[PDB]
Amino acid sequence: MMLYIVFILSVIFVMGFVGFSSKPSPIYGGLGLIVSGGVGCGIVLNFGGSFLGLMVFLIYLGGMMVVFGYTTAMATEQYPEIWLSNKAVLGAFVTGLLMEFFMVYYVLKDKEVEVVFEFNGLGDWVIYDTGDSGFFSEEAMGIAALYSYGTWLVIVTGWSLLIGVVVIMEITRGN
Amino acid sequence: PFFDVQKRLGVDLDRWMTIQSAEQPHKIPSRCHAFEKEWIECAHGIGSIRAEKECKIEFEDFRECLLRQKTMKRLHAIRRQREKLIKEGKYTPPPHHSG
Amino acid sequence: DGPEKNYERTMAILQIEAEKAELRLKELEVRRLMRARGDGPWFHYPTIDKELIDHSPKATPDN
Amino acid sequence: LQYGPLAYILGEKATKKMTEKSKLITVDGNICSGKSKLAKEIAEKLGLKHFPEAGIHYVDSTTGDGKPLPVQFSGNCSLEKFYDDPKSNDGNSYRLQAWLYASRLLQYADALEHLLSTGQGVVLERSIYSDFVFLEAMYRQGFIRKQCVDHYNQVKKVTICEYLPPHVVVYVDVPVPEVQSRIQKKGNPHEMKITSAYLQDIENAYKGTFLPEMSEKCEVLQYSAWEAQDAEKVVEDIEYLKYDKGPWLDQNDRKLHKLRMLVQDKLEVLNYTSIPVFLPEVTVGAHQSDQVFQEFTELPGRKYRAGYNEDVGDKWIWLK
Amino acid sequence: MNPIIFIIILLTIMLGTIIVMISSHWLLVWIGFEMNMLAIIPIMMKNHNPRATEASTKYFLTQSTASMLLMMAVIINLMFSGQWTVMKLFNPMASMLMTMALAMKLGMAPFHFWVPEVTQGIPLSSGLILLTWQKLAPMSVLYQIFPSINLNLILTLSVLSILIGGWGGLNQTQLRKIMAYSSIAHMGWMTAVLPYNPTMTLLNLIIYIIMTSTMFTMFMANSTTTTLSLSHTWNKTPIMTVLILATLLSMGGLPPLSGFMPKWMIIQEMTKNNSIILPTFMAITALLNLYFYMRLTYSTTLTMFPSTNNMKMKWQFPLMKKMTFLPTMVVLSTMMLPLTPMLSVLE
Amino acid sequence: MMTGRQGRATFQFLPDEARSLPPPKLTDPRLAFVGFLGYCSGLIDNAIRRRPVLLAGLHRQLLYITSFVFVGYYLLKRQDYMYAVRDHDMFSYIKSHPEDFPEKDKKTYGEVFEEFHPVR
Amino acid sequence: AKTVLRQYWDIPEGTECHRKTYATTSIGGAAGLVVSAYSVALKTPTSFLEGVARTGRYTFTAAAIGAIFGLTSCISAQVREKPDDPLNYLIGGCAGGLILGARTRSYGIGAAACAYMGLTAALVKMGQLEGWQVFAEPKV
Amino acid sequence: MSMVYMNIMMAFTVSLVGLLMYRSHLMSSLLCLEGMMLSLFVMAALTILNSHFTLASMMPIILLVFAACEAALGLSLLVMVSNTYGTDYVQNLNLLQC
Ligand SMILES: CCCCCCCCCCCCCCCCCC(=O)OC[C@H](COP(=O)([O-])OCC[N+](C)(C)C)OC(=O)CCCCCCCCCCCCCCCCC
Ligand SMILES: CCCCCCCCCCCC(=O)OC[C@H](COP(=O)(O)OCC[N+](C)(C)C)OC(=O)CCCCCCCCCCC
Ligand SMILES: Nc1nc2c(ncn2[C@H]2C[C@H](O)[C@@H](COP(=O)(O)OP(=O)(O)OP(=O)(O)O)O2)c(=O)[nH]1
Ligand SMILES: [Mg+2]
């Protein structure tokens, strides 16, 4: 049912994580993180944040494109490993999906599960707000306050990105 | 804060985002604004040792609004009971609950 | 020195050391009561300030 | 003010004071090959400072009053005793060579400081880059042990890497019989005991190991004994060198600032010349070292930091 | 490295730490650590050799993992309290992650394996920042969240740190590895008194910094990084060996030296709270620290190890190292016990 | 334990209420010891840099003594202020809670029985 | 671990020795699994069965020590009719030390383990009676 | 605590366990750090968007800004590791002994 779209996207979100957490060739690990970024954008986008969902997808699409170039230069071998070529990779991949299956199986059967925290399986739609906003997007108004309210945040992040460029040149200088 | 430069200098560096009942753009309220305000006003100036026991009612309502644990349990029981009655043909849903 | 000076110098010493001993024992009790009940200046862990709240009318009425 | 980060940030940058004449030149060759005469003349014609070849007493010439100290304050190393008895059991052979490397290492740092601090070039005689020829000669003739050569490479490996090679390497080739004949003419009773085999080991090290090594990093100029007499010809060749190779082309203000910080702190230059390696040749017992150190501090003008010695007429100690 | 760039990166390290101390919002605290790690790593890579590359990489991997756990704690604390204030956390699971994240940053056992290796792989000056300045920010956070820290977790880490630090320091001949294991052991004393009196955590941190900064300054003066290299100091700078003796005895907690004060005050607070078995165990286990400080005094000041001939050349040059604040630090690290009641200024 | 004290003077080295307390005497023994530590710093500075310990740089030795005494004077004012505040809170709390600090019924050793343990 | 300890301390001394042996053996076995985990993690076994062999070696040594302590300290408190006596734990602690010697094939470690494990067991029992706190709650 | 929070919190645990169990490639571990940041971003965005905490809506963006700095910093170190050994294997990073 489409009422569980958020839950169905979060299952793919975990499956993508098991994709790169099992650590095959970073080429295939990068693909797994793109799938998680794509569905993660979908999950966030269904809670009312379209800018946040599209932005994280946009940032991670460029992030894994640099990682792809770095994988062909410094993280490549003759036979890049897939989720089936190695027992250690395959073992961790099957284990991740089985735990995902059991958690999904129990939450949809009992409507509850207790692991550190107590989770509810009624559906994500039961916690949404029943009132409408006005003529604006609340997420957009909060993000636009960074420049009027977040003067201190803009300075530290701005300085951090500046020093970030200085640092990477220093680290990679080699002399 | 370990060093309270903000309070002495009179500069607000990060206090404006610490609570969700503070001033927001366009006076947009948070869903648990009333509950947070009550817990903050109950436990003002009395220390966390006292507030942990004397403002326990407000803080439990505030946590109920935040995570809705007790409401979802209540909905679960009603929904579970309705299925049991329907599964054994003992309850007819009304029209406005079906269409 | 004569016995009188030493005798009456000891009492001055015992008076100070006795007063400090009472204060040392009282402070331990005072610290015990403040930490258990939190109704004094010590062990006063901060709570969120109430001057951060905004009391003006919001966009929606139920707040 | 004293050179440091503050001086560099205020404008004292090496490139602003180095010109096309700011060259470091080294004159190499065998024993009695005219290096000293040739090197001294190239300094005058080119307007360069001249550094006489580092000897057992070089460090004494830069500190205190500049006069040589008694020989106990230098380990008792003697070039004379090396020639008379090159196989003595008191380890005077390698002890001399290890000391001489520390002197050349110190002189090279002094040379680099002058070049980088004023922009004037310098002319050296047998810099640290060529001191290994004598070591290779001593070992091949049984004058030092295998472990001593291991010690020399360890000390050299951690010191030579910090400096830059000379811009121009002048080598004065001379066949051994000419040197042996020339040594006898000089009439130094000790030097005359140098066997021909020893001089041939120096020749092999210079051509075969050294010049090929320096050919790819420096401007190597080779001159025979006959064409080395006229220093005018040698100076003319130097003036028209292209300088198209070597690490010196890759240096800039940051790199030279780091180099100058090293070469002005003499204890940092000599840090690794006394590594805790216990060879009998270089190891000194605690009782002996303690006694000699006490005697060193009671020489005129060496008990306290230079400028605070009353016995040598220093004044204003209480305001200094 | 350009001197101006070194100064800017140095100030960025301080700014990150200062942001953590003045921040009242959790997000800014996290930003402080991220800024601090961003600026520290280039100072570790300054000499650009394979060991420095490994040290920086091991440091980055550990610190990055800790910052992830700290952000998880902040978000979990946000879900259960709906506010970002830097105070006691409102969920037990958030406290454990934040406590462990702060333990990894401090290098407490059993999250200590990087401290011996990172310190060995970087120069002495970079190591001094690693073991003194990098401890201010994590200790700032623990000082504010201690009411919610699980007592068993924090005391367990403290006890393991005192044990591992003492044992690890016995099998070491590298000074940077000796100072590294000494640091781990001292972290235990700071966090052991944390549940009882956070003021004494500040006292031990201040005294630990002063003593630690004094040892590195004296190792930096002679460019000594090994026990045997330090064994030649008596033959070059005799005064420096006496100062090393006094400081090392102080670090061992022997009265009447300054370093006895933090142990003495920490035992007082724990015994007031009826904690008797732990202070006794901590004091006895600290004798492991005093043993490998005594072993350094023996080979440095109280005996005269063999010298080498070239040492005679070093007698003709003075110490050109800056040795900033060394005369002041060595005095504060040895003669401060008569001024012990001045610990009240920290309150 | 006094971090959150009701006194609304946060991040102040010496709150204005500390001016009601007597300042340390310039002849305070604690201040003399601090000054002495400055003198030892002066001599150690001369020794590490190989100068006449007692005579070299009397200008620098005086600045060591003055710098230590200057900083020591203010650390003593704050030290005494913090202990004055500690007693102020302690006595106020005891007054505000008389039931927790009752005046014990006085007894004399002629009335109190103490077991006797022979040493034989 | 809180669960098992509360189970152990709820059984009165010198009674139900079958249950107390179960509790102590659980505590020792868990300790031997914690040691095996770090040993396997930090000293990589050459093969899977070589690492399972190591886990079984340490886990059995710790389980045997825990089993012998609870058994020997419970019958001793039963025969003597003296429940609240640290001497019962001293006997139990030394027996555990001897088992460590047998597993290590060393007489010296057997003597040393008996002496120090015996004292520790006695000190643990005294602390239970007196109310000693290792991790004491802050009170002042 | 809806059923979505379970999967998001499980994603963080998977990426954490993935980061603590190295195989060979330093690049494979760097992906797990970027994976953990993604989980924290999603979990924080969900909580903030659901509670209508307007001003907190910028926090997830500030969380991505400093995730890039770390990711760039981790890549810069990976370049220097590769230049010294020709691979990004972590077993070569063992010159320093504990
Ligand atoms: C809260 C306080 C905390 C206190 C912490 C205390 C920490 C100290 C704990 C350290 C324990 C270490 C034990 C190591 C055992 C090693 C054994 C071994 O390997 O074999 C060695 C040797 C065998 O080794 P060997 O066979 O190769 O030969 C040894 C001789 N050489 C060296 C020449 C080879 O066996 C022994 O000698 C062990 C002796 C066993 C007896 C131990 C009894 C100790 C009792 C306490 C002391 C008695 C006085 C106190 C009395 C109190 C009365 C109430
Ligand atoms: C079913 C219910 C059972 C109940 C059992 C009751 C408890 C008895 C347990 C006995 C265990 C056992 O067998 O001990 C036996 C072991 C023997 O040494 P080993 O290492 O085996 O020598 C093996 C040698 N090889 C490998 C060559 C074959 O003792 C010991 O090491 C003790 C020896 C030293 C004496 C210590 C006493 C003095 C110090 C104490 C000071 C206070
Ligand atoms: N063992 C040893 N002897 C050295 C070393 N440097 C110089 N000598 C010795 C060799 C000679 O006997 C003496 C002088 O050598 P020279 O190269 O300077 O020859 P000389 O000055 O006599 O004539 P010249 O300058 O070349 O024209 O010093 C050295 O590094 N090791
Ligand atoms: Mg000559």
The Cα C25–Cα G72 span in angstroms is 45
Stretch (H or E) spanning D25:
strand D24-29
CATH architecture of A4-169: Up-down Bundle (1.20)
Residue H92 placed within a domain: no
The Cα A157–Cα E31 span in angstroms is 8
From G73, G94, G107, G116, mutation site for ligand 2 pocket: most ligand atoms within 8 A of C-beta: G107
* CB neighbour list of residue A156: distance below 8 Å, 6 or more residues apart: E19, E28, E31, E35
* CB neighbour list of residue H30: distance below 8 Å, 6 or more residues apart: A67, H71, H74, H75, H78
Q: How far is the CA of A114 from the centre of ligand 1 (A)?
A: 49
* CB neighbour list of residue D160: distance below 8 Å, 6 or more residues apart: D128, D129
Domain boundaries, chain A: 4-169
Q: Would you call C55 exposed, middle or buried from its count of C-beta atoms within 10 A (0-12, 13-18, 19+)?
A: exposed
Q: In Å, what resolution does this model reach?
A: 2.5
- Residues of C whose CB is below 8 A from F92: 41
Method: cryo-EM
* Length of chain B, in residues: 99
The Cα C17–Cα C12 span in angstroms is 9
What 3-state class would DSSP assign to E205? helix
The Cα F16–Cα E91 span in angstroms is 39
The structure tokens listed for E210 are 């002063």
Q: Do F82 and E199 touch (CB under 8 A)?
A: no
User: Contact E46/A174 with Cβ under 8 angstroms?
Assistant: no
User: Contact F6/F89 with Cβ under 8 angstroms?
Assistant: no
Q: Which of E19, E34, E45 sits opposite A171 (nearest CB)?
A: E45
Contacts 24+ apart (CB under 8 A), G45-48: none
Residue H93 placed within a domain: no
What 3-state class would DSSP assign to F27? coil
- Residues that place a CB less than 5 A from ion ligand 4: D 36
Q: Quickly tell me which residue has 């648990």 as its tokens.
A: B32
The Cα H64–Cα H39 span in angstroms is 11
Residue H90 placed within a domain: no
User: Contact E109/E164 with Cβ under 8 angstroms?
Assistant: yes
CA triplet D312, D318, D320: central angle to 5 degrees?
Answer: 80
In this complex, does chain B touch chain G, defined as having at least 3 beta-carbon pairs under 8 Å apart? no
B27 in A contact zone (CB under 8 Å): no
> Domain containing H65: what range?
3-85
In CATH, what number is assigned to the domain containing residue H62?
A: 1.10.287.3510
Q: What b/e sequence results for E289-303 when a residue is b if at least 16 CB atoms lie within 10 Å of its CB, and e otherwise?
A: bbebbbbbbebbbee
The domain tally of chain H equals 1
User: Contact A33/A60 with Cβ under 8 angstroms?
Assistant: yes
A152 in B contact zone (CB under 8 Å): yes
Residue H26 placed within a domain: yes
The Cα H74–Cα E37 span in angstroms is 11
Cβ of residue G111 lying under 6 Å from some atom of ligand 1? yes
- Residues of E whose CB is below 8 A from D91: none
Residue H95 placed within a domain: no
The distance in angstroms from the start CA to the end CA of chain F is 50
* CB neighbour list of residue F75: distance below 8 Å, 6 or more residues apart: E342, E345
Residue H96 placed within a domain: no
The structure tokens listed for C58 are 């919001």
The Cα H83–Cα H80 span in angstroms is 5
Radius of gyration of chain D (CA): 21
The Cα F54–Cα F43 span in angstroms is 7
| Contact residues, A window 121-140, toward C, CB-based 8 Å cutoff | 131, 133-134
The Cα A64–Cα H27 span in angstroms is 11
Q: Quickly tell me which residue has 């407490």 as its tokens.
A: E108
In this complex, does chain H touch chain A, defined as having at least 3 beta-carbon pairs under 8 Å apart? yes
Q: Looking at chain F, list the stretches that DSSP marks H as alpha helix, in order from N- to C-terminal side.
A: 29-48, 58-96
The structure tokens listed for D233 are 């010809």
